[PDB]
Tab-separated table of C-alpha atoms and ligand atoms in Angstrom:
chain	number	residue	atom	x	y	z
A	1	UNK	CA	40.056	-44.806	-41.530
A	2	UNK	CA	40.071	-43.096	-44.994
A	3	UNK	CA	42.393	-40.408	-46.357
A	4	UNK	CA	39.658	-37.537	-46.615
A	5	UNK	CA	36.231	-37.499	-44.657
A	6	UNK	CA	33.589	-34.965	-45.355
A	7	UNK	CA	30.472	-35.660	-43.800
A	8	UNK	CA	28.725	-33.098	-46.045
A	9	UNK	CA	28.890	-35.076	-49.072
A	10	UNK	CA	27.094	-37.889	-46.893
A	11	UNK	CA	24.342	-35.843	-46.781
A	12	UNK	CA	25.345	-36.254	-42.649
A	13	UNK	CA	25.631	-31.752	-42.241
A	14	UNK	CA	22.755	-29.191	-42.099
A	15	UNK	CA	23.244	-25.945	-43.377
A	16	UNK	CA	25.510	-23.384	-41.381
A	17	UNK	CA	23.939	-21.871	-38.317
A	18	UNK	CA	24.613	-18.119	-36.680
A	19	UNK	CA	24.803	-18.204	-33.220
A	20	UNK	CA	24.630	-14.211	-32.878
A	21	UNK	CA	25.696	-12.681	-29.433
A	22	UNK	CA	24.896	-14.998	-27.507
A	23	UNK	CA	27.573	-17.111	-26.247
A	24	UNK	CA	25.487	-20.731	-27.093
A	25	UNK	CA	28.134	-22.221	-29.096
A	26	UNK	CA	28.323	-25.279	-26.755
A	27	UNK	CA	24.345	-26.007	-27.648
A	28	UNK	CA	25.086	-25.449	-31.829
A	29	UNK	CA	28.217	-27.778	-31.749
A	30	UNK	CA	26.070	-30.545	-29.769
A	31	UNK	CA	23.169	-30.261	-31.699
A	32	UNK	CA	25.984	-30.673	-34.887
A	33	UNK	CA	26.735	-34.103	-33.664
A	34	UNK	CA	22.997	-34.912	-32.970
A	35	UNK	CA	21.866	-33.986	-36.785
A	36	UNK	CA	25.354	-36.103	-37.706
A	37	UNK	CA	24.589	-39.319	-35.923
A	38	UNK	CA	21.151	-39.245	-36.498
A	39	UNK	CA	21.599	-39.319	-40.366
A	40	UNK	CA	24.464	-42.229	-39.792
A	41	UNK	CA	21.991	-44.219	-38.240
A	42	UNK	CA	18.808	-43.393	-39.560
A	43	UNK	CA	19.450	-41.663	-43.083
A	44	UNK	CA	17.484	-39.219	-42.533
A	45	UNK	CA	19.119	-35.496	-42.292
A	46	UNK	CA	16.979	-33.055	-39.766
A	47	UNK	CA	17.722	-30.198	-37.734
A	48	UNK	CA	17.332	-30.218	-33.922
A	49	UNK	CA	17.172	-27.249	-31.360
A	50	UNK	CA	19.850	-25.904	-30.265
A	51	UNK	CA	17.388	-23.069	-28.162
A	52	UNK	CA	16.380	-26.508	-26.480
A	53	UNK	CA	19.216	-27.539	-25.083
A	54	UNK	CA	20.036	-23.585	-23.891
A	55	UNK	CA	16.740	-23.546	-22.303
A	56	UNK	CA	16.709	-26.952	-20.801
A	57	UNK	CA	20.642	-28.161	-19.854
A	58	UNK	CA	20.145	-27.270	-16.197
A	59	UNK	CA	24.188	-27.463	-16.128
A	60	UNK	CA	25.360	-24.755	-18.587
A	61	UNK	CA	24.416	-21.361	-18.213
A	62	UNK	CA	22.425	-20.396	-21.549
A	63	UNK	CA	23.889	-17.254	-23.146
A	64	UNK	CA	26.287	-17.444	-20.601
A	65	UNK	CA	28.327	-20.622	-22.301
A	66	UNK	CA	28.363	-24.205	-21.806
A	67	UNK	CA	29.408	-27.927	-21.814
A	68	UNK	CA	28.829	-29.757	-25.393
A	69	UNK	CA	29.267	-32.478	-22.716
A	70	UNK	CA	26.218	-31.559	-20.571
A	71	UNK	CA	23.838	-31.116	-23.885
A	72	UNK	CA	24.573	-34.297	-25.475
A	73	UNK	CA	23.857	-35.888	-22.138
A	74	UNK	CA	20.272	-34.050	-21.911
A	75	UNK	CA	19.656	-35.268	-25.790
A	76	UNK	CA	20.872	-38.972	-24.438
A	77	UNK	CA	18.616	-38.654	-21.222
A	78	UNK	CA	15.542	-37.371	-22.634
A	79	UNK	CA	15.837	-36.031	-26.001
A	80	UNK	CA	15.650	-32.869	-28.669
A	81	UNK	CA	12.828	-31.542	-30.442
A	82	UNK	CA	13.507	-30.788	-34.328
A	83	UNK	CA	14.722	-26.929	-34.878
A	84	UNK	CA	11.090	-25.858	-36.538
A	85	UNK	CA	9.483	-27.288	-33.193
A	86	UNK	CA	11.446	-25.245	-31.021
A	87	UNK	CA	13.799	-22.407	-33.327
A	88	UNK	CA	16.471	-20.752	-32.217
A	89	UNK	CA	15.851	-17.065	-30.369
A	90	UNK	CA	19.642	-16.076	-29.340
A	91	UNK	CA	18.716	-15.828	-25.657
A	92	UNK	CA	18.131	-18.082	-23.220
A	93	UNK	CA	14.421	-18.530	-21.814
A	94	UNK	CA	12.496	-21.205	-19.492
A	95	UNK	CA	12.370	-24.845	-20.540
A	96	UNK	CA	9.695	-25.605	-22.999
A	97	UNK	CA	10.879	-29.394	-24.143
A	98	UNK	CA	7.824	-30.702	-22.217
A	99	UNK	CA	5.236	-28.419	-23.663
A	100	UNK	CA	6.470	-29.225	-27.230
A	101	UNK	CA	5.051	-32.739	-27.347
A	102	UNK	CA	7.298	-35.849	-27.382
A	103	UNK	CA	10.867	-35.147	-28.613
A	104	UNK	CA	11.950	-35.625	-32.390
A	105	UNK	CA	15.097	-37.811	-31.537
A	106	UNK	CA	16.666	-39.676	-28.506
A	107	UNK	CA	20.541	-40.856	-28.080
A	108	UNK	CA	21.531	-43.496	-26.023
A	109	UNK	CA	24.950	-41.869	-24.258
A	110	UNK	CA	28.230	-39.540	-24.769
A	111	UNK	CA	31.317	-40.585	-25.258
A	112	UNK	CA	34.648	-38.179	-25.026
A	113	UNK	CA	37.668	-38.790	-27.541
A	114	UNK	CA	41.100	-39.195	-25.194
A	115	UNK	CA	42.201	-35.693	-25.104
A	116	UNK	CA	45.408	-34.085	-26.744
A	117	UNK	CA	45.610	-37.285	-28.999
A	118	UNK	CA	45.305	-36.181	-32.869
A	119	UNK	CA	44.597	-39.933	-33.921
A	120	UNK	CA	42.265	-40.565	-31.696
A	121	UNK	CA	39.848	-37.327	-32.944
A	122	UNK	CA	40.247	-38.395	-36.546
A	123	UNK	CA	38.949	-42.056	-35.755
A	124	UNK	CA	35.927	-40.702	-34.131
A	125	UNK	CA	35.102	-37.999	-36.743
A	126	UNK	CA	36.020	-40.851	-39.394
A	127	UNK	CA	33.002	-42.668	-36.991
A	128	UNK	CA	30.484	-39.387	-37.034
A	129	UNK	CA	30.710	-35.510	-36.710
A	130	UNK	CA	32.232	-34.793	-33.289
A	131	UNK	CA	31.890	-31.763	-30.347
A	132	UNK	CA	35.329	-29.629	-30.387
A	133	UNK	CA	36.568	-26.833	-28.594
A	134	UNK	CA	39.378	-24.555	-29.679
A	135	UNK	CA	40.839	-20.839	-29.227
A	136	UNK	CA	38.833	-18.643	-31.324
A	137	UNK	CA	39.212	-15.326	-29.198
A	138	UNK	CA	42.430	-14.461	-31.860
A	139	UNK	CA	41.644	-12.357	-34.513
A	140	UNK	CA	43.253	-14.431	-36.655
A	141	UNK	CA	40.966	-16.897	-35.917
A	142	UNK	CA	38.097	-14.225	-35.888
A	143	UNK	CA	38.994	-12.807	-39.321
A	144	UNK	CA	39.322	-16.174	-41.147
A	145	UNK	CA	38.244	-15.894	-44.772
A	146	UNK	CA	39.868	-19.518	-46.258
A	147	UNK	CA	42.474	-21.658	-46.382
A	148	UNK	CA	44.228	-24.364	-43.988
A	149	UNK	CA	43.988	-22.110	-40.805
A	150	UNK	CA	47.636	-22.902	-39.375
A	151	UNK	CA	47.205	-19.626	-36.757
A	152	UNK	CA	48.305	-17.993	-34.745
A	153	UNK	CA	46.474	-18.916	-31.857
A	154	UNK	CA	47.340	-20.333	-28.190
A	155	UNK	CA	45.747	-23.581	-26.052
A	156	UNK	CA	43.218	-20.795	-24.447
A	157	UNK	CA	39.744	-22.905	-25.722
A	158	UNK	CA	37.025	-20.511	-25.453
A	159	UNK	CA	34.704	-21.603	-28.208
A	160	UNK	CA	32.978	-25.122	-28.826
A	161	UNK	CA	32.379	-25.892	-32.899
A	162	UNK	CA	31.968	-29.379	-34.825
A	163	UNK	CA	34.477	-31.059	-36.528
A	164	UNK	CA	32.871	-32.747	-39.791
A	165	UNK	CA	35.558	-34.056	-41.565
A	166	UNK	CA	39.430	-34.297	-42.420
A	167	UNK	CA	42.380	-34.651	-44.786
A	168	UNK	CA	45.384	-35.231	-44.786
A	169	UNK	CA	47.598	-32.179	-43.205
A	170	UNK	CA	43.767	-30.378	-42.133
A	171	UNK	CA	40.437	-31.145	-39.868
A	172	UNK	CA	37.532	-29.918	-41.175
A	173	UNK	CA	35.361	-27.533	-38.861
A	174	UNK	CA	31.479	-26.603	-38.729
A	175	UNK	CA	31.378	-23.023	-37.078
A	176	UNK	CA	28.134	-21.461	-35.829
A	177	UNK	CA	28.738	-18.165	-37.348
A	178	UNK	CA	26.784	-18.163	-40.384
A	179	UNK	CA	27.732	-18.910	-43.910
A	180	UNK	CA	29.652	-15.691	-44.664
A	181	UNK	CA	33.121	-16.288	-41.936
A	182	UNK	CA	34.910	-18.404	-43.422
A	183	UNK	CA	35.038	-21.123	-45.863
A	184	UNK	CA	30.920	-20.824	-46.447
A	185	UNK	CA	30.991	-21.442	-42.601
A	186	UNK	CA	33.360	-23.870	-42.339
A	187	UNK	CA	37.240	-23.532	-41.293
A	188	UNK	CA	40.166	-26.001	-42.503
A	189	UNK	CA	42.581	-26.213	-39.646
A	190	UNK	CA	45.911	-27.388	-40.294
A	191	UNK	CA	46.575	-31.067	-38.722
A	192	UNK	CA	49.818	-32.914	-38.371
A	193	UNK	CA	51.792	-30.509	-36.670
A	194	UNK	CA	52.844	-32.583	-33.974
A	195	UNK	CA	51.835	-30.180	-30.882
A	196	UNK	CA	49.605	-32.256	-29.249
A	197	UNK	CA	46.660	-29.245	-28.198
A	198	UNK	CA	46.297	-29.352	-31.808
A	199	UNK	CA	46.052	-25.832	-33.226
A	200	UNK	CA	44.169	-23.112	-31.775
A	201	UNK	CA	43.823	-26.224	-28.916
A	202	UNK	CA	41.666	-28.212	-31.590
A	203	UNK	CA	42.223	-31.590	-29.403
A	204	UNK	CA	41.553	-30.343	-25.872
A	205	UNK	CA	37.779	-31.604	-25.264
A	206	UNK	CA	36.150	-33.453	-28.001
A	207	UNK	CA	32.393	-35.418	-27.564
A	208	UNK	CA	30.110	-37.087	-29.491
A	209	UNK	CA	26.305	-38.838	-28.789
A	210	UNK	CA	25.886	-42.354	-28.997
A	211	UNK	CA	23.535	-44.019	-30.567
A	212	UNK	CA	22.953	-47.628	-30.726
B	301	E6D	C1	30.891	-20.228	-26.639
B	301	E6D	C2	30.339	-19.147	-27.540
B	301	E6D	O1	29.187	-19.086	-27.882
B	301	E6D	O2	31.246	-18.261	-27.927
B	301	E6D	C3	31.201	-17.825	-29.303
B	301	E6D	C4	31.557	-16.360	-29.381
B	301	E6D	C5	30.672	-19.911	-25.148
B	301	E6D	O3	31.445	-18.820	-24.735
B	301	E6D	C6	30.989	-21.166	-24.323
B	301	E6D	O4	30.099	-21.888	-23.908
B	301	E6D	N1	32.278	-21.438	-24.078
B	301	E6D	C7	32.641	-22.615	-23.322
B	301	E6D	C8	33.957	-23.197	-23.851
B	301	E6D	C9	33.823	-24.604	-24.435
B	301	E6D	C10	32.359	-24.964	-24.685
B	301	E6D	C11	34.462	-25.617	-23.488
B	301	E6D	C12	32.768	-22.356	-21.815
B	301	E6D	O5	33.613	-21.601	-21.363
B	301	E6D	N2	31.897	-23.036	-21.057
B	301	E6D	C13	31.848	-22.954	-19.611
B	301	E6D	C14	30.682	-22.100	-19.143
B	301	E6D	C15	31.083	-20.754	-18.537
B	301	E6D	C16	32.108	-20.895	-17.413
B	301	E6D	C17	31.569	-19.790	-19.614
């Protein structure tokens, strides 16, 4: 796997989202990976709904939070709508992926990335944009502006974001807090460091769709 991976420049990442209040960070990171791996295979770059997967994953809790796992296995069991189908309204309402005519895109599984293993994250997000979690409850972390984030920040994972790339002593992260936090949106967290949470607990639960 290369040196540097950025899946913007593959034309593989959608523009920033903003979650708001609501705590549906689990639904924006999946839906990350979706819009990733459906480029990879496909070539085409679209935006899918992250309201569906809050409305619909019967196993996270809307607003409430939520498994990246458990939405990437309801876009590999029955699918996602694109975003303009079904936008995003920052609170969780009833299901609607059945009145919204056939889904836009279908995966075929989930994998997860072996956990507190720094290689093994930068093979898969060398392969596609993956699911992460990390700590982002410090207001370090909260008040980012630039830079290789090194910290400080513990192993307490509290917020799920998409990793989209890497270099050398960094991986490259997606937020869901609009373009302004921030690198435009995105946040460089140091790599290499040889705790193996990762930083801010970047290598605790990590998940991306398959698609064949
Ligand atoms: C993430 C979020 O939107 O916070 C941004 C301010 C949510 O709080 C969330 O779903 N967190 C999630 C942690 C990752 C996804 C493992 C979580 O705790 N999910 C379990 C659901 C419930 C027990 C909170």
């Amino acid at each position: 796997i290369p040196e540097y991976v950025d899946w913007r420049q593959k034309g593989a990442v959608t523009p920033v989202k903003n979650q708001g209040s609501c705590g549906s960070c689990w639904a924006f990171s999946a839906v990350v990976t979706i819009e990733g791996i459906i480029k990879i295979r496909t070539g085409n770059l679209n935006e899918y709904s992250e309201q569906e997967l809050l409305d619909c994953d019967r196993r996270s809790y809307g607003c409430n939070g939520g498994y990246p796992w458990s939405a990437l296995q309801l876009v590999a069991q029955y699918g996602i709508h694109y975003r303009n189908t079904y936008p995003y309204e920052g609170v969780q309402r009833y299901c609607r992926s059945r009145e919204k005519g056939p889904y836009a895109a279908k995966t075929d599984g989930v994998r997860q990335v072996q956990p507190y293993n720094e290689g093994a994250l930068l093979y898969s997000i060398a392969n596609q944009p993956v699911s992460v979690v990390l700590e982002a409850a410090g207001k370090d972390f909260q008040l980012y502006r630039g830079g290789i984030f090194v910290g400080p920040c513990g192993n307490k994972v509290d917020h799920a974001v998409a990793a989209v790339g890497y270099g050398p002593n960094y991986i490259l992260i997606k937020n869901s807090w609009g373009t302004g936090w921030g690198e435009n949106g995105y946040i460089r967290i140091k790599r290499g460091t040889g705790n193996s949470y990762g930083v801010c607990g970047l290598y605790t639960s990590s998940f991306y769709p398959v698609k064949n």
